[PDB]
């Protein structure tokens, strides 16, 4: 039985004032450095412990001792995602609910059916890098974003946000990002209750108003015309749990529209940005992947068997969720009194963080060259030590998202890769924005089309 290891305080504040930063997650990464597997994180009314290696991690990955938890971050976003699936407890009957009536729509078979359309949004980002002039440069996260964004819209419910023909975002995006930049940085403050975020307050309050009247509009819209479409949306209205025997309300169903929307937004776009990234910063890994681009990708259209014959670009996604997970972090409580690893008794109800991209960086499972990107870790799946690999979260509260999601970065990256020959024209330097997510900022290339026409 050992004490934790703190950080350094700030009197009352306690260790508040570290997370007042716009990099919190990369801060947390340099203390876990510091600090090594776990460490206490007090603020006012509030204790977390940071979990960082595999051998703690484990443990917290064991759904009999431990539950997710919503952060304060999940807390602030619930304002507008309600109780959809990333922002419920696992006990609100519209968790299982959900997640019943859901599952079918998300698993590797109905991938077959949204290909069509995750290639419709593909193709329109391969045109548009075609049609760039000689002096031109790609906005690697800007485009990443309006193709993700767009997959989701059309997949979820069979509208076109029209990304790739707007420089400003469509409305419903401007109150979304707007509302998510409101839910991160309320999480920094101190003094909350200051009238000088009165104006955060109002603006929060027209940007839910934004989400909740576009959404609840195709909702509407969608039972009035009685269109049976191949969208996420069509499948909310149909689906019954199997367990309550009840659908969906249409107050959940917004819910769930409004999640699948941040998560499109935030989480795939950041993948592909640092796919594209490591590709450039690793010339051999580029080339092996363009070679498999090149031999597997043989129609102008691909086809949803050739995606997944795409095996190393999918080891090339995992090494970028392995170095930068997207999605940071998440949380768990203890369901009941327990000692984790045999040092650290906790009480029923404390929490947790699962820090990814420390996780990710445990020595004692990758070696010695864990800052090194080699998607040749990833050949052999099963020599992957279970709970060692965590960018898509745990258990029965995983990502639903997770098959969609690798199936579109795999498609869209195997698709530039095909088209595109791509420099690092001003050797960029890594700066990670963080929102919801991480993403590169500022990561900027020059492609030169093979000429391959589509
Ligand atoms: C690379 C892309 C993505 C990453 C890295 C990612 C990561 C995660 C992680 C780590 C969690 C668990 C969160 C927690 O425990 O608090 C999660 C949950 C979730 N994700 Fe994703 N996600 C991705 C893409 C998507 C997409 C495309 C969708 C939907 C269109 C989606 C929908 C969800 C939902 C609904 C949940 C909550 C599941 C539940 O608890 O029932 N995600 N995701
Ligand atoms: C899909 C990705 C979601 C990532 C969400 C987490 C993202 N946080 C954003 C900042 C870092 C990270 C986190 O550790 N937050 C804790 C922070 C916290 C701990 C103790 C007291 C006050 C606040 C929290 O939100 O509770």
Same mark, same amino acid.
């Given at each position: 039985?050992? $004490?934790?290891?703190?950080?350094?305080?700030?009197?009352?504040?306690?260790? =508040?004032?570290?997370? &007042?930063?716009?990099?919190?997650?990369?801060?947390?990464? @340099?203390?876990?450095? $510091?600090?090594?597997?776990?460490?206490?994180?007090?603020?006012?009314?509030?204790?977390?412990?940071?979990?960082?290696?595999?051998?703690?991690?484990? $443990?917290?990955?064991?759904?009999?001792?431990?539950?997710?938890?919503?952060?304060?971050? =999940?807390?602030?976003?619930?304002?507008?995602?309600?109780?959809?699936?990333?922002?419920?407890?696992?006990?609100?009957?519209?968790? @299982?609910?959900?997640?019943?009536?859901?599952?079918?729509?998300?698993?590797?078979?109905?991938?077959?059916?949204?290909?069509?359309?995750?290639?419709?949004?593909?193709?329109?980002? +391969?045109?548009?890098?075609?049609?760039? &002039?000689?002096?031109?440069?790609?906005?690697?996260?800007?485009?990443?974003?309006?193709?993700?964004?767009?997959?989701?819209?059309?997949?979820?419910?069979?509208?076109?946000?029209?990304?790739?023909?707007?420089?400003?975002?469509?409305?419903?995006?401007?109150?979304?990002?707007?509302?998510?930049?409101?839910?991160?940085? @309320?999480?920094?403050?101190?003094?909350?209750?200051?009238?000088?975020?009165?104006?955060?307050?109002?603006?929060?309050?027209?940007?839910?108003?934004?989400? &909740?009247?576009?959404?609840?509009?195709?909702?509407?819209?969608?039972?009035?015309?009685?269109?049976?479409?191949?969208?996420?949306?069509?499948?909310?209205?149909?689906?019954?749990?199997?367990?309550?025997?009840?659908?969906?309300?249409?107050? &959940?169903?917004?819910?769930?529209?409004?999640?699948?929307?941040?998560?499109?937004?935030?989480?795939?776009?950041?993948?592909?940005?640092?796919?594209?990234?490591?590709?450039?910063?690793?010339?051999?890994?580029?080339?092996?992947?363009? $070679?498999?681009?090149?031999?597997?990708? +043989?129609?102008?259209?691909?086809?949803?068997?050739?995606?997944?014959?795409?095996?190393?670009?999918?080891?090339?996604?995992?090494?970028?969720?392995?170095?930068?997970?997207?999605?940071?972090?998440?949380?768990?409580?203890?369901?009941?009194?327990?000692?984790?690893?045999?040092?650290?008794?906790?009480?029923?109800?404390?929490?947790?963080?699962?820090?990814?991209?420390?996780?990710?960086?445990?020595?004692?499972?990758?070696?010695?060259?864990?800052?090194?990107?080699?998607?040749?870790?990833?050949?052999?799946?099963?020599?992957?030590?279970?709970?060692?690999?965590?960018?898509?979260?745990?258990?029965?509260?995983?990502?639903?998202?997770?098959?969609?999601?690798?199936?579109?970065?795999?498609?869209?990256?195997?698709?530039?890769?095909?088209?595109?020959?791509?420099?690092?024209?001003?050797?960029?330097?890594?700066?990670?924005?963080?929102?919801?997510?991480?993403?590169?900022?500022?990561?900027?290339?020059?492609?030169?089309?093979?000429?391959?026409?589509?």
């Amino acid at each position: 039985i050992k $004490e934790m290891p703190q950080p350094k305080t700030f009197g009352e504040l306690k260790n =508040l004032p570290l997370l &007042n930063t716009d990099k919190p997650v990369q801060a947390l990464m @340099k203390i876990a450095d $510091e600090l090594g597997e776990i460490f206490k994180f007090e603020a006012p009314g509030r204790v977390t412990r940071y979990l960082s290696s595999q051998r703690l991690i484990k $443990e917290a990955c064991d759904e009999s001792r431990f539950d997710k938890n919503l952060s304060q971050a =999940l807390k602030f976003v619930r304002d507008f995602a309600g109780d959809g699936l990333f922002t419920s407890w696992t006990h609100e009957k519209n968790w @299982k609910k959900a997640h019943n009536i859901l599952l079918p729509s998300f698993s590797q078979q109905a991938m077959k059916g949204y290909h069509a359309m995750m290639v419709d949004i593909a193709v329109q980002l +391969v045109q548009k890098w075609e049609r760039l &002039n000689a002096d031109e440069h790609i906005e690697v996260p800007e485009d990443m974003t309006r193709l993700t964004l767009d997959t989701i819209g059309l997949c979820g419910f069979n509208y076109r946000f029209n990304s790739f023909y707007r420089d400003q975002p469509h409305p419903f995006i401007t109150s979304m990002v707007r509302a998510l930049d409101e839910a991160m940085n @309320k999480l920094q403050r101190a003094n909350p209750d200051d009238p000088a975020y009165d104006e955060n307050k109002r603006q929060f309050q027209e940007d839910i108003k934004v989400m &909740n009247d576009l959404v609840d509009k195709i909702i509407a819209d969608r039972k009035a015309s009685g269109e049976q479409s191949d969208d996420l949306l069509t499948h909310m209205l149909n689906g019954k749990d199997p367990e309550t025997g009840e659908p969906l309300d249409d107050e &959940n169903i917004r819910y769930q529209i409004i999640t699948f929307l941040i998560a499109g937004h935030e989480t795939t776009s950041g993948l592909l940005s640092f796919a594209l990234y490591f590709l450039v910063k690793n010339p051999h890994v580029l080339q092996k992947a363009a $070679e498999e681009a090149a031999r597997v990708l +043989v129609d102008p259209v691909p086809s949803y068997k050739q995606v997944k014959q795409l095996k190393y670009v999918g080891m090339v996604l995992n090494e970028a969720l392995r170095l930068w997970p997207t999605a940071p972090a998440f949380s768990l409580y203890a369901k009941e009194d327990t000692v984790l690893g045999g040092e650290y008794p906790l009480e029923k109800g404390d929490e947790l963080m699962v820090l990814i991209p420390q996780l990710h960086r445990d020595k004692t499972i990758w070696g010695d060259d864990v800052e090194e990107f080699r998607p040749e870790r990833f050949e052999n799946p099963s020599a992957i030590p279970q709970h060692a690999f965590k960018p898509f979260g745990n258990g029965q509260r995983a990502c639903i998202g997770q098959q969609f999601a690798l199936h579109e970065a795999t498609l869209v990256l195997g698709m530039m890769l095909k088209h595109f020959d791509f420099e690092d024209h001003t050797n960029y330097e890594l700066d990670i924005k963080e929102t919801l997510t991480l993403k590169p900022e500022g990561f900027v290339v020059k492609a030169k089309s093979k000429k391959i026409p589509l």
